[PDB]
């Protein structure tokens, strides 16, 4: 009677806490079955950024070979232009001067012969 009274209210207090527990074990399920979807997508996203990064690796060496390549050609070329030019100077410097030296002698020879003609 008065005992089944503090016994019913004591059982209905568990039913409330069973349905409360059940309410919360369903959410704590919504979380784990949802972090898994975003952990499989970020598990995938991670290989797409590691394969995309392997292309930056190939394109890095590929373009480093060009840069480095070209560089040598520049020097080879610079030394080439240089040498060429630095010579064209000696060439002229030397000949124009060899010519003038020459013309000089002719003038001189002719003078000591136009002098031996007027005396």
């Amino acid at each position: 009677e008065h005992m089944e009274s503090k016994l019913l209210e004591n059982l209905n207090l568990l039913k409330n806490e069973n349905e409360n527990l059940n309410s919360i074990f369903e959410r704590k399920n919504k979380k784990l079955k949802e972090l898994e979807k975003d952990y499989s997508e970020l598990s995938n996203r991670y290989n797409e950024q590691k394969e995309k990064m392997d292309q930056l690796s190939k394109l890095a060496k590929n373009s480093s070979a060009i840069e480095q390549s070209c560089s040598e050609k520049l020097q080879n070329m610079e030394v080439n232009y240089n040498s060429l030019l630095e010579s064209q100077n000696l060439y002229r410097d030397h000949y124009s001067d060899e010519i003038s030296k020459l013309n000089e002698k002719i003038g001189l020879l002719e003078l000591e012969l136009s002098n031996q003609n007027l005396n």
């Binding site: 020097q75 080879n76 030394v79 080439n80 240089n82 040498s83 060429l84 630095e86 010579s87 064209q88 000696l90 060439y91 030397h94 000949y95 060899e98 020459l102 002698k105 002719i106 020879l109 000591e112 012969l113 031996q116």
Partner: protein, 428 residues
């Protein structure tokens, strides 16, 4: 006047034979320098010379003409008495030009008293004995040992051409012609003896010292990029200064101190080129630039002391420019041939053969080109004397206009010995 018809004849020939390929500039200039030298020789158009003594007289005491007339003795004293004996590494420095002073005085008053067939003797005996001493000197006393006797000798042909100014303007049929001719004469057999001793001394000097320095390794070697050659270059310089010293510690004429440095380069030029197609080893456009730049430092020490230095090393500074511009168009090359005016096609065929690009079977020398040469090579060869030469020899011009008198300093650094000393008293 008659002879104005022999010229016009031998000439009418040199023009028909004058005016077989469109030879280039370098070939044409030679062609010219030849027609010119020729024509000149044609404008100056001999039989029995004889040695003769002359009369004495003037400033000739009865004891003076007496010492002279005893050649046998002033010489021996000069020769074996002190000249041969003199230790160069140890001469007061007071009298440095001693030997020259001395040698002159004698020759001087010996000539004053027209006893030529007495001096010619002396001087000839002296020359042979100086030369000797030079062709002796230790591998060390080969440095300040050479110089010392050379600048002393460089003065002889001078204080000869000067001893000419003296007996000239007179006009006397005996103590002038026979004399003006024995002195104009001496100038020669002295100049010979000087140059020839100098050329064999210098050469020899450079050989030995080029190893002390080990110049190859610092300017024509791959193994050394390092500022280490900048460390050895330091030694080179530390060495040139030393060499500079000498010349001065020994009142070496001025326009001589100079010929020397040009010559110095010249040898190095040869040697540097020669080994460039020997050791070298493999040539490469880059290798050129290394060596071109190394050559910069070497010339660096001369920039300040002498004028126009790089014309001595033309043979290699040029050579190198080539390597520095690997060519692949036969035409380009063909057009740029006129460029290298210091190397004959033969040596180019040399520099260019010993060429392989470490670039990795990349920058390879053409066959089309290598040919053009071999051809040009052959053509020239028969066209003049018989094969052009490749290896570079080393030789230096005369010291004719680079020798100098100057009684001044001579005495300023000249004292004396025995017999001569008294021969100077009784002079004037």
């Amino acid at each position: 006047e008659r002879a104005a018809a022999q010229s016009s004849l031998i000439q009418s020939h040199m023009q028909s034979l004058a005016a077989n390929k469109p030879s280039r500039l370098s070939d044409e200039v030679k062609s010219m320098k030849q027609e010119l030298a020729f024509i000149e020789n044609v404008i100056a158009q001999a039989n029995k010379p004889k040695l003769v003594n002359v009369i004495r007289r003037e400033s000739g005491n009865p004891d003076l003409l007496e010492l002279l007339m005893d050649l046998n003795s002033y010489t021996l004293e000069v020769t074996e008495g002190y000249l041969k004996k003199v230790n160069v590494t140890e001469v007061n420095g007071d009298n440095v030009l001693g030997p020259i002073h001395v040698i002159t005085t004698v020759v001087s008053s010996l000539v004053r008293n027209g006893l030529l067939i007495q001096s010619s003797k002396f001087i000839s005996k002296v020359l042979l004995t100086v030369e000797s001493i030079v062709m002796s000197l230790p591998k060390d006393e080969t440095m300040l040992g050479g110089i010392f006797w050379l600048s002393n000798l460089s003065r002889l042909p001078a204080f000869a051409a000067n001893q000419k100014t003296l007996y000239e303007a007179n006009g006397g049929d005996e103590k002038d012609k026979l004399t003006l001719i024995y002195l104009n004469d001496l100038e020669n057999e002295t100049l010979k003896v000087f140059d020839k001793i100098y050329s064999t001394w210098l050469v020899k000097f450079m050989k030995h010292a080029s190893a002390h320095i080990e110049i190859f390794d610092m300017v024509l070697n791959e193994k050394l990029f390092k500022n280490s050659g900048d460390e050895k270059f330091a030694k080179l310089f530390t060495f040139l200064n030393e060499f500079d010293a000498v010349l001065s510690k020994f009142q070496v004429v001025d326009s001589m101190h100079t010929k020397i440095f040009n010559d110095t380069l010249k040898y190095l030029n040869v040697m540097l080129f020669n080994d460039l197609i020997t050791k070298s080893p493999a040539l490469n456009w880059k290798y050129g630039y290394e060596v071109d730049r190394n050559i910069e430092r070497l010339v660096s020490w001369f920039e300040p002391r002498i004028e126009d230095v790089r014309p001595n090393l033309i043979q290699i500074i040029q050579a190198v420019k080539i390597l520095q511009l690997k060519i692949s168009n036969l035409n380009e090359f063909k057009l740029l041939f006129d460029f290298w005016y210091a190397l004959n096609p033969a040596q180019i065929q040399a520099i260019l053969l010993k060429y392989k690009p470490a670039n990795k079977g990349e920058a390879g020398v053409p066959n089309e080109i290598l040919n053009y040469l071999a051809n040009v090579i052959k053509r020239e060869n028969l066209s003049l004397p018989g094969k052009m030469e490749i290896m570079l020899s080393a030789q230096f011009d005369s010291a004719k206009n680079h020798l100098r008198y100057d009684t001044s300093a001579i005495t300023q650094n000249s004292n004396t010995e025995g017999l001569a000393t008294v021969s100077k008293i009784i002079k004037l």
